[PDB]
């Protein structure tokens, strides 16, 4: 028989107890917590070292902000 110590009595001993005896819950939570913690702490390291961010794609016809200068050619 294996009893629950509780997370509060000993932290790392509870982590070891969950790893040996409830491996589906411990590893489900480990794969889940590896996501957003890495999304917080690993993306500025990538932008500083691996490659910077891509330029944005266009979505419609790109209008400039000008005032219709005259054009020559193809009158008739």
């Amino acid at each position: 028989i294996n009893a629950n110590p509780g997370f509060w009595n000993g932290p790392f001993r509870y982590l070891r107890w969950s790893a040996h005896n409830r491996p589906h819950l411990f590893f489900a939570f480990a794969i889940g917590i590896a996501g957003p913690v890495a999304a917080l702490t690993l993306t500025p390291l990538r932008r500083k070292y691996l490659y910077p961010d891509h330029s944005p794609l266009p979505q419609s016809y790109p209008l400039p902000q000008r005032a219709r200068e005259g054009l020559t050619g193809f009158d008739d």
């Binding site: 266009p58 979505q59 419609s60 016809y61």
Partner: protein, 183 residues
């Protein structure tokens, strides 16, 4: 070529017909099976109008979860039912007819804005003009309808997705909390 014209009207008639077999069926689960047929008629109408995405969302969500839930209830539970005898519902028939007329017409009324009441109803029926569809070349990518829903659920109405998460949470917690009998 013009055999493919009246389809929408056919589905309307077919949908009407299906509801009469829902409210009048001796066995319950036979009438719930007629409701499954009514979802199929709805998905036919939604493909037919131009919304092919929704039709499969109806077949997935309504038919495959809600109806499966309903049939699953009716199996292992006890429900008495009485047949549609003429003697018990012939007393209902006049209020049925009056409510059919009034609720049908008055549902057809608010699509229209003349102050005169009879002009409100006739604008319900003047639809026989054929809308002209023009090709505009302004769009460069295949944003489908589901892409646009995923852009508006996620940026402009992200809070509605998040309050919706609270609702889905409640739909988990509730049935559990009723049917536990803790200890």
């Amino acid at each position: 070529m013009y055999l493919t014209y009246y389809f929408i009207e056919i589905t309307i008639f077919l949908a009407i017909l299906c509801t009469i077999f829902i409210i009048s069926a001796k066995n319950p689960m036979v009438s719930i099976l007629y409701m499954i047929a009514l979802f199929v008629i709805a998905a036919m109408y939604l493909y037919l109008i131009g919304l092919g995405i929704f039709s499969l969302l109806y077949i997935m969500i309504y038919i495959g979860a809600i109806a499966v839930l309903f049939l699953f209830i009716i199996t292992l539970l006890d429900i008495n039912s009485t047949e549609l005898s003429v003697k018990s519902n012939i007393r209902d028939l006049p209020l049925v007819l009056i409510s059919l007329i009034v609720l049908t017409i008055s549902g057809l009324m608010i699509y229209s804005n003349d102050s005169i009441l009879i002009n409100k109803l006739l604008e319900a029926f003047g639809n026989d003009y054929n809308t002209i569809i023009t090709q505009d070349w302004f769009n460069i990518e295949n944003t489908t309808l589901l892409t646009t829903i995923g852009n508006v659920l996620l940026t402009n109405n992200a809070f509605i997705l998040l309050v919706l998460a609270i609702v889905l949470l409640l739909g988990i917690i509730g049935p559990i909390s009723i049917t536990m009998k803790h200890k």
